Amino acid sequence: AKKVAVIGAGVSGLISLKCCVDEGLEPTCFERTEDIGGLWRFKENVEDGRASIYQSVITNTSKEMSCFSDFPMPEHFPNFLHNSKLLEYFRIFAKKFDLLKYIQFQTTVLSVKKCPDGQWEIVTESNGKEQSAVFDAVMVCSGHHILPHIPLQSFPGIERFKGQYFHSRQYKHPEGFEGKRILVIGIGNSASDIAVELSKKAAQVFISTRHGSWVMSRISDDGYPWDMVFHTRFSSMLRNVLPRTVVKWMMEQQMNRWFNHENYGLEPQNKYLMKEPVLNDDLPSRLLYGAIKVKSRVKELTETSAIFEDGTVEEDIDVIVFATGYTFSFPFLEDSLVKVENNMVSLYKYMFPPHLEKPTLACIGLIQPLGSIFPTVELQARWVTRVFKGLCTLPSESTMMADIIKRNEKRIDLFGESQSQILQTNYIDYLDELALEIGAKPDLLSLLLKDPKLAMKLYFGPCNSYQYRLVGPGQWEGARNAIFTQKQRILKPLKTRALKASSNFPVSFLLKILGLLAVVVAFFFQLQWF
Amino acid sequence: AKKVAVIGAGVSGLISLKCCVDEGLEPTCFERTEDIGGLWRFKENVEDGRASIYQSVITNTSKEMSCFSDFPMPEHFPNFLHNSKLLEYFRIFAKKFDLLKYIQFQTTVLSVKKCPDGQWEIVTESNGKEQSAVFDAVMVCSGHHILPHIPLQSFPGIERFKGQYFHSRQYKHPEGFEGKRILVIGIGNSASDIAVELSKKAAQVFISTRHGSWVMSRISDDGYPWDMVFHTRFSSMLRNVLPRTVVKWMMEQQMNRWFNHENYGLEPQNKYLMKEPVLNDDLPSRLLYGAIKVKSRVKELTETSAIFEDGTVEEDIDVIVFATGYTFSFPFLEDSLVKVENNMVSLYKYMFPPHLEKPTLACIGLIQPLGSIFPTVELQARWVTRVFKGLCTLPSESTMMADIIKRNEKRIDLFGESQSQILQTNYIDYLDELALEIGAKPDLLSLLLKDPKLAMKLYFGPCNSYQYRLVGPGQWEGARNAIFTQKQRILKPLKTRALKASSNFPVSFLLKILGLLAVVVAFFFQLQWF
Ligand SMILES: Cc1cc2nc3c(=O)[nH]c(=O)nc-3n(C[C@H](O)[C@H](O)[C@H](O)COP(=O)(O)OP(=O)(O)OC[C@H]3O[C@@H](n4cnc5c(N)ncnc54)[C@H](O)[C@@H]3O)c2cc1C
Ligand SMILES: Cc1cc2nc3c(=O)[nH]c(=O)nc-3n(C[C@H](O)[C@H](O)[C@H](O)COP(=O)(O)OP(=O)(O)OC[C@H]3O[C@@H](n4cnc5c(N)ncnc54)[C@H](O)[C@@H]3O)c2cc1C
Ligand SMILES: NC(=O)c1ccc[n+]([C@@H]2O[C@H](COP(=O)([O-])OP(=O)(O)OC[C@H]3O[C@@H](n4cnc5c(N)ncnc54)[C@H](OP(=O)(O)O)[C@@H]3O)[C@@H](O)[C@H]2O)c1
Ligand SMILES: NC(=O)c1ccc[n+]([C@@H]2O[C@H](COP(=O)([O-])OP(=O)(O)OC[C@H]3O[C@@H](n4cnc5c(N)ncnc54)[C@H](OP(=O)(O)O)[C@@H]3O)[C@@H](O)[C@H]2O)c1
User: Is the Cβ pair A289, B78 closer than 8 Å?
Assistant: First the structure.
């Protein structure tokens, strides 16, 4: 299988495109829009078929935790990115790896039909007249933050409500909602970012939840990004092995350092969970300021008031904004292919339909991991390109149907029953899973003997995308290197001002003690017991 | 002295006005503007004689750490205040205590002249024609954040610079500086707030300092306001008694918890100091995002570039904003009265001119303490009204001239040599000083025996304004009370969503152990040593 299809030029489209040329395939990318990036290409209107983002979105993952395994973000980039500055990375990636030539822009995909199976018959439309073609295999990168989910039916009285109401998707700018009374629904990173942005210049903002989330800043230990302290092999172990509610005590304490969540009033119901927490740096302060007040779930709505689950009422609310998240569909696809039933997506590892017979089609970017997606869809694409070729193989339908069950059953146990968590997954464990398949996952134990400086820094240090190019196929020398020098690149854009003292004999601080102090303790009651 | 003058209807004017009626005097307040609040009354233009604030200023002191000693902020107020919501408190204070009748608006004061001394002859102008009157004593509340300090002469090349440049004072709105390259000077809470606000929607913002400050959020331990953990008798002791550079290690560690200041690049020169640190909740994040880059002092300016002290250069900078702070003058006053020479204000405790012979004039609000000013200028006014009457007395000029020296000599040693710190002062120590004079400062030691629940909470708990109405003159029953119930009022506006489980036999935390665990340890090797 050489002639391959990639639906959409999202992030996922661009990485598969590269993973393809890398496994020596010939890809054709269809893009509905004029340009690349999908979600991350901010436009002011809300054009259909592509996800809207509000002008002021910043990423919630470090640059050295979210760059591709063999392509670090330039040193002069900040560790969290304005959507526009991220797009740039993408553009700069599509330049370096010459991926832009396969993109057919303004060429939406209308149907992907099976041939007499191992190929596919894809109907696309260009500017008016619609052509047709056949492909050996298909990669689907159409996104899943496009269909707004607006659960109006669990807001009795909405009909009666005057004012103005609209879903997060629609949101772009705050100018216009000056000094208005505004209620936002949900504790989506959307809800939070929105509420906050609007709250600075608004009369009052509220924010509804039944369940309440845990808030958390991207600022972490010594102002290093949260993800490079949170996502580290070693810590993952702890989360997995340690008893569930011993990890709960651990979460509670970690999360509460910033502020007491009970007091600020977004204590979660079941702290049991390990759902995705919200990554706003402003929300706690903005509550403190009083610009936002959290609130129980809207019980009922009237013309200009809102009743609440705890029997409170807020009056003269000019605006409701439903940041109740999104859904996803495949309207160019067999209705049996992407079977999604009772909160469960039947896809082998959110990728392959198990009821296929030739493993020639997979869904990339239909997943929401606790860490960055970009390195996730890269290993998604590595595993897939290699399956198509046949260098990699699925088990039997029997096996794949059994995994899909047990994965989902674990998942709901770990992230709750919400319609917002169909695609939740622990970050590393998954990344490992994908790299086992293609045998690109380092086996540290063995490596400890060869290279201990790595072994330590791979397990205890931050689990970069880079790690997955140490062993296995299609490697990158600047992977060992990248890892060892990431501290430079993280501080390049920050540490923009120099004192200039010394570190050979400075009377500042003290240090060295911690070294010598323990060194002597080493040599204690260890006299030769043969 | 009955007939008293209060220059200006600032915060200081309004508290003296109240302190006056309270010590049974008859005041006349002159106000240059149409209304009260001075600084805190946001207007869109920058009218002369009154301090400008930018539309979006929030306080940097808790409500229960900054309300007046006998007038708590309404419970439904947030703990940090939009300038407008603070003004409201003031208006609500001017209502309750009926102070608005003494205010002559649109009546600026032109000269305060000594009579044949113990009175004063004040020339004021109304709408056109200027009248005159005599007063027994004078209280000056004209502010000191009105005269911009623009040190153009330590920016070689400014003449050459095209673009646009203007001082913090002038600032109001960010709209207009979209996608412009902008450099702000200094690490004033101004500089910081400004830089930040502008940075979200700007091409790039820089922020110059030679010296670099310590940044710190208003969010503190368990999301309680910083001031109620920082400003507590007990902690003050530590700061005073402990060796200077042992308090340094203590600051370093406290401050650095949020982020490593070296890495983010505002490591201070001499960490020795206890200068005022900046209170921005946003700046660390906004650096991380890359919207602000800190920078060494501007060495030199050109037409569209800026050279730096460390030999860096930023290019095409459309705007310079000098947030280099303010100064102060008294243009309605004898030039010998407020003698200010080589970084030293010769005023007994930033209040009384020592070269007077009848102590009948004092300056209130000419001071910048590490805590809230509002309770500071209240004890300033209590001490003063009582001096006028003669219930309180200054020492001899010999003594007062010696204090002024030693105070200043301590001060420079403690806050550095900057002309941004002429009026710096440790918060409590001063508040105590003022309350000693009128004997309203509790002596805890004695009270330990009488009331231990207080004694503990007065020393170890937060040092509210309320404390100074426990003993001494003009008290308030709701002072003991206020103190004991402040936790309610702080949580009233925050804790706006409740779970409803239990706290008599609930499973999914633990607690009580820490109690019983230590309790048993108490009764160890203490068997009757008579
Ligand atoms: C607000 C927000 C913030 C996020 N922040 C982060 C973050 O900081 N870090 C992180 O790792 N992840 C983040 N994510 C998740 C993830 O990065 C995005 O979901 C990611 O951009 C998805 O890329 P994709 O290629 O899968 O989908 P998209 O980028 O949505 O790609 C959609 C593409 O498919 C095309 N398309 C659709 N239909 C057709 C058709 N019929 N034919 C041809 N083309 C079609 C579209 O036109 C478009 O080019 C965020 C998500 C949201 C909503
Ligand atoms: C941005 C900013 C934020 C701050 N935030 C805080 C905070 O959160 N907490 C805190 O404790 N401190 C804060 N401060 C410091 C402090 O609160 C202010 O300096 C305080 O408002 C000063 O009050 P005042 O009465 O001394 O002066 P102002 O409130 O400036 O009083 C000036 C008034 O006097 C009048 N006047 C002037 N000249 C004359 C004259 N010749 N005759 C008659 N009337 C005259 C004016 O017309 C005006 O009405 C802040 C300062 C700034 C700049
Ligand atoms: N980088 C960024 O800054 C950024 C910004 C925005 C979004 N994102 C991305 O997009 C997602 C963030 O969340 P989202 O806002 O897009 O959608 P989401 O994750 O699905 O969350 C939407 C929220 O609406 C809540 N909700 C729905 N119905 C509700 C009801 N009746 N009452 C109360 N709450 C209700 C949900 O709570 P329950 O599910 O518990 O009911 C959920 O918390 C993440 O997956 C994130 O990666 C990222
Ligand atoms: N609630 C709020 O958010 C808020 C907001 C704004 C202001 N305020 C208050 O207002 C007061 C004043 O703040 P402000 O910023 O207006 O004035 P400021 O605190 O005096 O700050 C002025 C800054 O300019 C710097 N500067 C002066 N000369 C310089 C030079 N030659 N090179 C480089 N930098 C130089 C100063 O540094 P040097 O000390 O080295 O001169 C200082 O950091 C503060 O006490 C604060 O409490 C509060």
Answer: yes
Token pair 């108490």 is found at B522
| Interchain contact, B496 vs A293, CB within 8 Å | yes
Chain-centre distance of CA A514, in angstroms?
39
Q: Residue B37 CA: which ligand 2 atom is closest?
A: 29
Instruction: Number of A to B CB contacts under 8 A, please give it.
Output: 147
Q: How far is CA B44 from CA A302, B464, B521, in A?
A: 37, 34, 63
- Cα gap A57→A73, rounded to integer Å: 19
CB contact under 8 A, A493 and B222: no
Q: Cα(B208)–Cα(B188) distance, rounded to whole angstroms? A: 11
B410 Cα: distance to centroid of ligand 4 (angstroms) = 21
Helix (H) or strand (E) holding B285: helix B283-289
Contact B217, A285 (CB under 8 A): yes
Residues of chain A with CATH 3.50.50.60: 3-146+328-434, 150-217+258-326
Identity (one letter) of the amino acid at B79? N
- For chain B, say whether A282 makes contact (Cβ under 8 Å): yes
Beta strands in A361-416 (DSSP E): 361-363, 368-369
Please compute, for residue B211, the number of CA atoms within 13 A of its CA located in the half-sphere on the CB side. Answer: 19
Q: List Cβ neighbours of B131 (8 Å cut-off, separation of 6 or more).
A: B124, B125
Q: What are phi and psi of A140, to 5 degrees?
A: -105, 120
DSSP structure class, residue B352 = B
Tell me the β-bridge partners of A58.
Answer: A82
Q: How far apart are CA B456 and CA B461, in angstroms?
A: 7
Distance, CA of A501 to CA of A367 (rounded, Å): 49
Q: What is the DSSP string of B182-221?
A: EEEES--HHHHHHHHHHHTTSSEEEEE-SS---B--SEEG
Q: If residue A193 lies in a helix (H) or strand (E), which one and from where to where?
A: helix A189-199
- Put simply, whether A271 touches B (Cβ < 8 Å) is yes
Structure tokens belonging to residue A163: 């004012």
3-state secondary structure of B61: coil
Pull the structure tokens for residue B396.
């001899």
> How far away, in angstroms, is B254 Cα from ligand 4 center?
22
Cβ separation B222–A259 shorter than 8 A: yes
Please report which helix (H) or strand (E) contains residue A5, including its range: strand A3-7
For ligand 3, atom 37: residue with the closest CA:
A186
The answer to whether domain B150-217+258-323 has CATH 3.50.50.60 is yes
* CATH number of this structure's domain A3-146+328-434, picked from the four choices 2.40.160.20, 3.50.50.60, 1.10.10.1400, 3.40.630.10: 3.50.50.60
H helices then E strands: how many in chain A? 16, 24
A212 touches chain B (CB under 8 A): yes
Q: If you take atom 17 of ligand 3, which residue's CA is the nearest one?
A: A325
Q: Which superfamily does CATH assign the domain made up of A150-217+258-326 to?
A: FAD/NAD(P)-binding domain (3.50.50.60)
Task: Say which experimental method was used.
Answer: X-ray
Answer yes or no: are the C-beta atoms of B381 and B397 closer than 8 Å: no
Contact predicate A197/A174, CB 8 Å: yes
Looking at chain B, which residues constitute the CATH 3.50.50.60 domain(s)?
3-146+328-434, 150-217+258-323
Breaks (C-N over 2.5 A) in chain B follow: 117
The first and second tokens of residue A395, run together, are: 């088990």
Distance in angstroms (rounded) separating the CA atoms of residues B195 and B204: 10
Contacts of B522 (CB under 8 A, 6+ apart): none
CB-side neighbour CA atoms (13 Å) of A216? 24
CB of A219 within 8 Å of a chain B CB? The answer is yes
- A263 CB neighbours in chain B (<8 A) are 222-223, 491, 494-495
**Residue type for position A423:** L
Round the CA-based radius of gyration of chain A to a whole number and report it. 25
Q: Which two tokens stand for residue A482?
A: 């990248």
